[PDB]
């Protein structure tokens, strides 16, 4: 048989169900077989020797373990190469890496950063599954602090846009919840427990 392309490319989603048609090897009875698999482990792909359609097996794929798979295949000699990229699904919750969060605000200052909150997500870097969406659980009902997501480091930057009175002894201590920008996958949804991370605000007594 003669293959129609030396390099085939397909994609399948992370946590794909069993017998999900990944892609199709084209050549032109034709009997196929898998010559080799990198990283060869675990056996997550199945080649139907009669039709040449590559499916997923009962071994659920895992992207954070293996980025992409390289198959060397034969048809009945010539060997063809196939690259299968696993598409990420938001199946890992972010965990706040920084623990002791005690911001130091300066009295009567506007448009100044209050603090930084480091975050970790095992999801694909740069995708919506990886960026962190911050919501103010409590302590910012008065509209003083604003939080943004530095996508470069996936960090929650807390800044201030309102002048504060130190002598007022305003209890600016607050607490936040962390969640990825894209909705969580069905695997961990209903397992998501939004435990709030607090942060303390310290006010400089400007003289």
């Amino acid at each position: 048989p003669v293959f129609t392309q030396d390099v085939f490319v397909g994609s399948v989603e992370e946590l794909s169900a069993a017998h999900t048609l990944v892609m199709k090897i084209n050549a032109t009875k034709i009997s196929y077989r898998i010559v080799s698999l990198e990283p060869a482990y675990p056996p997550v792909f199945y080649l139907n020797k009669d039709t040449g359609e590559i499916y997923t097996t009962s071994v659920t794929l895992d992207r954070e373990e293996h980025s992409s798979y390289t198959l060397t295949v034969e048809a009945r000699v010539k060997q063809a190469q196939v690259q299968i990229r696993i598409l990420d699904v938001n199946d890992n919750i972010p965990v706040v890496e920084n623990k002791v969060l005690e911001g130091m605000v300066e009295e009567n200052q506007v448009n100044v950063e209050v603090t930084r909150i480091k975050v970790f997500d095992a999801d694909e870097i740069g995708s919506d599954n990886w960026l962190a969406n911050f919501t103010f659980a409590s302590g910012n009902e008065g509209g003083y602090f604003h939080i943004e997501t530095d996508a470069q480091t996936n960090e929650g930057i807390v800044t201030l846009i309102k002048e504060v009175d130190y002598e007022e002894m305003k209890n600016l201590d607050f607490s936040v919840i962390v969640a990825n920008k894209a909705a969580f996958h069905k695997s961990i949804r209903s397992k998501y427990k939004p435990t709030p991370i607090p942060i303390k605000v310290k006010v400089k007594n400007v003289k």
Binding site: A179, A183, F184, K186, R189, S190, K191, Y192, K193, P194
Partner: protein, 197 residues
């Protein structure tokens, strides 16, 4: 054989129960099937939302709602006091069999195993379980069910009580205002020793 079933039927055309007190009419369909199995009754219960105020419950992170069924000494459903406003009946095809019932007493919780007005045996009047709400994005949020059998009678005419309370307290709301379609709870099956015929 059909005499051994006591159910509301399968998907009654119109809403037949009022769970939320705020509702001025029936706000959902309560599908309940009680089957005699030797010395026990197999109860099979779930709810299908109808009214918008009921279906909107899918958008709240913490919800709870209760269905109370009260039966007189002969087992007939007290519609005026209960949450199910359509009397139970036997099986005819996939519907209720229109006609009188005389053996309803056999389906009710036994007044011995589940006694009225006794604190010492109180703990024996509670069953617990869990169902699932399937989301529009194909999740499965667990709903905690607490069932109480005849352990308290509010009125004199009440002779058997079955209070089923669904609740959840989750992280993310199952649905959003636009994606919310209906509140259908996965079937819940429980067992209770039945009263003597």
């Amino acid at each position: 054989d059909n005499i051994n079933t006591l159910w509301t039927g399968v998907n009654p055309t119109e809403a037949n129960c009022q769970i939320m007190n705020s509702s001025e009419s029936n706000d959902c369909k309560l599908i309940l099937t009680l089957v005699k199995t030797g010395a026990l009754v197999t109860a099979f219960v779930y709810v299908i939302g109808v009214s918008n105020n009921f279906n909107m419950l899918t958008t709240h992170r913490n919800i709870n709602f209760t269905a109370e069924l009260f039966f007189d000494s002969t087992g007939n459903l007290l519609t005026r006091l209960s949450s199910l406003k359509t009397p139970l009946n036997h099986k005819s095809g996939q519907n209720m069999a229109t006609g009188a019932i005389t053996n309803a007493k056999g389906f009710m919780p036994s007044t011995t195993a589940y006694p009225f007005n006794d604190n010492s045996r109180e703990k024996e009047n509670y069953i617990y379980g869990t169902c699932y709400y399937t989301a529009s994005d194909r999740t499965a949020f667990p709903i905690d069910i607490s069932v109480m059998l005849n352990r308290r009678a509010i009125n004199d005419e009440t002779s058997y009580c079955i209070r089923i309370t669904w609740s959840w307290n989750t992280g993310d709301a199952p649905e959003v205002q636009t994606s919310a379609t209906t509140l259908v709870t996965s079937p819940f099956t429980f067992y209770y020793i039945r009263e003597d015929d």
